[PDB]
Design a protein around this ligand. Structure first.
Ligand SMILES: OC[C@H]1O[C@@](CO)(O[C@H]2O[C@H](CO)[C@@H](O)[C@H](O)[C@H]2O)[C@@H](O)[C@@H]1O
Ligand SMILES: [Mg+2]
Length: 580
DNA sequence: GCGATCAGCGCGTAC
DNA sequence: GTACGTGCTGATCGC
């Protein structure tokens, strides 16, 4: 049965009620400077469809959109807010975002459209977006009649689903998490994405020119050593050259053939000179394809800025994800890749990039939740945690800790945070399973509180069916009761890791909200550009650096109060690379 | 059967 | 452990 609604030719007063389900449809996946294909409003007076060209040109509608006292319920309001920002229109008063609500209730549903969220409450009087717009190469906006009914049905679902979703959130004690954390953060992310980050395109192009030369050279060297030409990027063609032709040892295999991962290649290097060249080729290729060419493809030619989109409703732990381009995985560990950061610069003259990062926030969070006396004392003394762990595991003084000892203790620490397992650590340190088990046993003898937490959290996950974070975010783990060892194993590791990774996410998210409030109170021009899980990147006039040096660390360190101190390091400079 | 497309995944970056 | 972009490739689409 068709849903009744008014296909409006002009905006009327009843469309401007102080409470409404609002749909501002942006079909393009990347909503930056994208078209708004239609608008739908559902309130106490009825259901309406408005053509964007009409509504967005109407002074009354635009004022209504920007009136904080006129409440709107939406699905993915950030998408609409940003699309509107590009049109110079402000969106205010969003009091409920169904996407964020669904995400908090259960990240595992993969809810990416109104229909998926509605299905959670037995509401199916709305079609999935893919059914209406199509998929891939056949994706397209349908004629007005079809488009109009779809947007109205989505607004109608939002209108009806608000109460049930808020009730369940309240039951889960997650209503504040939605209203005080995620929704306010959504607005901050919209500002960050809209602002974008300035790119020194000529610097990237220059790097691309040099890389192209080095690539060609290494490429020819590889063919000379292989005794023939082939597609070095082909797993089967490379696997044949290395393991069948050159007969190098097969140390590891994939599900479809031979493994050629970097760690495997490193072990084969001694056997043939072609190996080091392949590694070099891949190193150069990674930078060229993903960080040079890939980055240049998404830079806006008119402003030379990249505008990422922070997916706020995707990760199972509460973290954000970044796309087109992903600005959360720009190289930093190795100098060759780190240089890519010299290309990210301040958007204005006499401005600088300012970066602040939490020092070991996940291990500090673990110390707090596990209430492990030894670990808490270590952080209270602000000790080098990996050296400290080496001292405990190997039972030696600080001076007796060798570089290799610290390296292995470091790996144990990461394993503990990620959800420890003898098999896992054994692969990471290239040792036997029995040897890994010994490291783990030694670790738990030194950190009995951590051991207890790991045991208790897995049992809690089984009893309750989910695990939670400091701010009440939750993750269901049905596989915790799987009869398949491997499957259950993953679930147990997720039970151990989620509260840590997730609580770390809750903390930085609150820090972002607190920071923006302080920047505004202080009248600073400084503003957030990016968030990379445990760090925040801002840009501001050079005249604001000294104040930022005191303000940013304090806000981030005081976001929450834990049993151990929170520590934030910071640096600033002319480019992202220099903010080190 | 085959070119175009889609869908899975090895790989390598980040934290 | 949590992600994303990439290039290749087997599966599936569309003739
Ligand atoms: O607007 C981001 C928001 O939209 C979803 C779908 O509801 O993802 C879409 O947009 C992302 C950013 O462009 C794409 O990566 C994704 O492929 C596309 O479906 C949500 O997952 C996200 O929170
Ligand atoms: Mg750090």
């Amino acid at each position: 049965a068709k849903m009744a609604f008014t296909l409006a030719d002009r905006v009327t007063e009843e469309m401007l009620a102080d409470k409404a389900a609002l749909v501002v449809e942006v079909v393009e996946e990347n909503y930056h400077d994208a078209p708004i294909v239609g608008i739908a409003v559902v309130n106490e007076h009825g259901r309406f469809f408005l053509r964007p060209e009409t509504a967005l040109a109407d002074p009354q509608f635009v004022a209504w959109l920007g009136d904080e006292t006129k409440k709107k319920s939406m699905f993915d309001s950030k998408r609409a807010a940003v699309a509107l920002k590009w049109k110079g229109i402000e969106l205010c008063g969003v009091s409920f975002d169904l996407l964020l609500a669904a995400y908090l209730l259960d990240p595992a549903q993969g809810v990416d459209d109104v229909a998926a969220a509605a299905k959670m409450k037995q509401y199916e009087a709305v079609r999935p977006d893919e059914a209406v717009y199509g998929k891939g190469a056949k994706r397209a906006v349908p004629d007005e009649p079809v488009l109009a009914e779809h947007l109205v049905r989505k607004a109608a679902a939002i209108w009806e689903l608000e109460r049930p979703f808020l009730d369940e959130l309240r039951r889960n004690e997650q209503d504040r998490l939605l209203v005080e954390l995620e929704q306010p953060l959504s607005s901050i992310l919209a500002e960050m994405e809209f602002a974008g980050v300035k790119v020194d395109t000529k610097r990237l192009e220059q790097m691309g020119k040099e890389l192209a030369e080095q690539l060609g050279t290494v490429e020819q060297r590889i063919y000379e050593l292989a005794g023939q030409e082939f597609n070095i990027n082909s797993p089967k063609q490379l696997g044949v050259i290395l393991f069948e032709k050159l007969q190098l040892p097969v140390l590891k295999k994939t599900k479809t053939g031979y493994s050629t991962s970097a760690d495997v290649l490193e072990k084969l290097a001694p056997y043939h000179e072609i190996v080091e060249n392949i590694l070099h080729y891949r190193q150069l290729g990674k930078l060229q394809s993903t960080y040079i060419e890939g980055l240049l493809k998404v830079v806006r030619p008119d402003t030379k800025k990249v505008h990422t989109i922070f997916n706020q409703a995707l990760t199972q732990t509460g973290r954000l994800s970044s796309t087109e381009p992903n600005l959360q995985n720009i190289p930093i560990r190795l100098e060759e890749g780190r240089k890519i950061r010299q290309a990210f610069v301040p958007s204005e003259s006499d401005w600088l990039i300012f970066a602040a990062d939490y020092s070991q926030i996940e291990l500090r969070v673990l110390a707090h939740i596990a209430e492990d006396d030894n670990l808490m004392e270590a952080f209270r003394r602000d000790l080098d945690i990996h050296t400290k762990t080496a001292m405990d595991i190997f039972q030696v003084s600080e001076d007796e800790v060798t570089p290799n000892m610290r390296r292995q203790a470091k790996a144990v620490n990461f394993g503990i945070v990620y959800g420890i397992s003898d098999y896992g650590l054994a692969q990471n340190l290239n040792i036997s399973r029995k040897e890994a088990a010994e490291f783990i046993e030694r670790y738990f003898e030194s950190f009995p509180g951590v051991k207890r937490y790991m045991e208790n959290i897995v049992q809690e996950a089984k009893q309750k069916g989910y695990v939670t974070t400091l701010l009440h975010r939750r993750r269901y783990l049905p596989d915790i009761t799987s009869r398949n060892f491997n499957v259950r194993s993953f679930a147990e590791r997720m039970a151990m890791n989620t509260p840590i990774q997730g609580s770390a996410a809750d903390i930085i998210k609150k820090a972002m909200i607190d920071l923006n409030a302080r920047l505004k109170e202080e009248r600073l021009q400084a503003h957030l550009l990016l968030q990379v899980h445990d760090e925040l990147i801002l840009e501001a006039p050079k005249e604001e650096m000294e104040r930022l040096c005191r303000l940013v660390p304090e806000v981030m360190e005081q976001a929450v109060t834990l049993r151990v101190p929170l520590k934030v390091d910071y640096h600033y400079g002319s480019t992202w690379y220099d903010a080190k």
